[PDB]
Enzyme design. Sequence first.
Site, PDB file in Angstrom:
ATOM      1  N   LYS A 106       2.289   4.732  -0.972  1.00 47.60           N
ATOM      2  CA  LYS A 106       1.633   5.936  -1.459  1.00 47.60           C
ATOM      3  C   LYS A 106       2.131   7.280  -0.624  1.00 47.60           C
ATOM      4  O   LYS A 106       2.582   7.146   0.401  1.00 47.60           O
ATOM      5  CB  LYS A 106       0.192   5.776  -1.423  1.00 47.60           C
TER       6      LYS A 106
ATOM      7  N   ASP B  47       0.941  -1.164   0.174  1.00 47.91           N
ATOM      8  CA  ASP B  47       0.066   0.156   0.015  1.00 47.91           C
ATOM      9  C   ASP B  47       0.796   1.212   0.148  1.00 47.91           C
ATOM     10  O   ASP B  47       0.478   2.236   0.548  1.00 47.91           O
ATOM     11  CB  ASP B  47      -0.948   0.011   1.222  1.00 47.91           C
TER      12      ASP B  47
END
Length: 277
Positions: free
Chosen positions: A135, A133
């Site tokens: 980001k 994940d």
Amino acid sequence: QPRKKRPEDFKFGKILGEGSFSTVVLARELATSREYAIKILEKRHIIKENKVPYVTRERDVMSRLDHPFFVKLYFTFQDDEKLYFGLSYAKNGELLKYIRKIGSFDETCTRFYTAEIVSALEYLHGKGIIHRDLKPENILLNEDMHIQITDFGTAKVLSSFVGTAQYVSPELLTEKSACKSSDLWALGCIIYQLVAGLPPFRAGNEYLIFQKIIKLEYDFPEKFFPKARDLVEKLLVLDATKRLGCEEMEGYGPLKAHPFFESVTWENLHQQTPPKL
Ligand SMILES: CCNc1cc(-c2ccc3c(N)[nH]nc3c2)nc(N)n1
């Protein structure tokens, strides 16, 4: 090791972050005057939602990490209703805040920060760990303006879940299967977003974003640094076995040797003075 710390050891302050199952709060330890970012998780809610595996994995992963480009887990404790994780405090907050603040990065800043992200990934991947994940919200900026990557509950430790929609790799939407390349896909997106100011796959809703991803439907603005564009294209590849940096492409050597990184000294990035934004 010291005796277990407790809530009363701290002067809590402002909220640093909010998630579905957790809240991060700035706290100053009183004995030391040190600032930690304390992640607070309510046991009942975690159990009620079957998150115990994720909490467990985050704690175990963040303990195995020992590197300047990763938020550190200093300690844990609990009271009746809550778990507390003592984390590094990244004073300058999210990379996302800077992308928005300044619009897009020039070549020098893009090169330095991409190199730090790459160097962090190399370390993570060397320990057999996948973030899943990655980001700009997860990529924090220390007081000295070096990155510190956080948020590891969704990580996998190599011998199900879907991260943020715009950074999701095609293989997740077609197989429910992931690997290091998923992190590299997200890296391609982050580089694009540093350079262009926006993530490469944007649409009115998640379904549409997913469509564009599996179709590789995005394109480069005309002002895009060519060498960065070539690197992004060698990352946003539908076949995960052909992304620069992954094992079938022989790993991080060829990635780090990419022309875009020509002027980089990889060995001591954390010792270098980040370029001014
Ligand atoms: C609520 C989102 N979930 C999170 C959030 C954070 C986090 C957020 C901000 C931080 C800061 N300014 N210093 N440290 C920080 C750690 N860390 C994890 N591990 N999970």
